[PDB]
Symmetry: D2
Subunit: 114 residues, 4 copies
């Protein structure tokens, strides 16, 4: 599993459950095209987005549908989504974890590359 | 100044100076139109991006070019940029400050919205 | 103003107003002496905690009373307080801004240190 | 395992390995007294700090020796440590994860309570 995503809720102190996550890869022009997607588990994790064969060098955008998440909880959100854009495999393949921490008017994201 | 950006560097404990910022606005056809752009000052602030007349309702994206910033400091970062997408002025005009805190493999962004 | 604190609220997208802050300094006997205290203004800023003469070298702790803040907003938070402990002025005097971003189960703090 | 700690490095994009973590419980006066301690694993995690029997309601301080961590990497740090102070079991016992994300001049911490 070369790309994992983990989403935490800073208002409730819990994983962010059932959050929709869409991954895009940048194409020959510049257009963003869909690559992978899923919903966070009860642990706030999304595994099996890709396989190593499919996850080649490139620029990727991970867009976290945080707006719908807060909306489901009846909380007023600021962002349309959180968007994490990065080059992967700059030097061949690695394991990537993209972690996001969500609040209504703020978010932070970090990458663990191993 | 209805749209301001403030950027800090968490490695060096300082404002993030001369960071490129581009602001786009979603167009009728679901596409991102250039809206405004600038570079942060020695205080890590970017003022004068727009005006209250030009800053109408819409969905805006503030892209902070964190990759050039880190490279111009000699360091290889993870992110292509730090992005913040939000709907603005939907219930009247508001003043927005977008603050971002940068590290090479992480960033944080917050919006302070006042009336 | 060699020691300033700025506090934001990430739930409401605003400065965190009337937040109590206490600053302690480690004493010769390894104990925390009261140094300064105040409350943030409507801009979430706390100025005038100290003076450059009083702010000598040492290890300081800035305690931000996030628990009272959240309670006075009607909400049950995780942390007793947000704390930041750092050595100051060890290689000459410096100006420090301690910025903190608050959520009920999380907080972030950054220091901006200028010369 | 009712108290876990996880520490990530935002400069290197990796778990923060071999970081010393000291937990204290507040006593009848106010004095802080040692309760638990350990070093982060290769995954940046510290498990087995306590057991449920031992981890009762109270105020706890988790102090993360971030200064020595950066020092070991030859990077100049700002903080003496990161300190996370919280009431636990306010309403009986829970599982607590305290997560910290470290930079030389910044840190963020969040609690996942389950
Ligand atoms: C803890 O502060 C954060 C800020 C932004 C993104 C992530 C974190 C924290 N932890 O991420 C790791 C979560 C986990 O591994 O369970
Ligand atoms: C303090 O923690 C932060 C995390 C992410 C982005 C901003 C901050 C803090 N302050 O931003 C305000 C900076 C200022 O207005 O001096």
């Amino acid at each position: 599993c070369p790309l994992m995503v983990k989403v935490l809720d800073a208002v409730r102190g819990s994983p962010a459950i059932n959050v929709a996550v869409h991954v895009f890869r940048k194409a020959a022009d510049d257009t963003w095209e869909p690559f992978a997607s899923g919903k966070t588990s009860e642990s706030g994790e999304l595994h099996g987005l890709t396989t190593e064969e499919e996850f080649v060098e490139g620029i990727y955008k991970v867009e976290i549908d945080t707006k719908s998440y807060w909306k489901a909880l009846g909380i007023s959100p600021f962002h349309e989504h959180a968007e994490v854009v990065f080059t992967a495999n700059d030097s061949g393949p690695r394991r990537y974890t993209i972690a996001a921490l969500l609040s209504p008017y703020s978010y932070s994201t970090t990458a663990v590359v191993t």
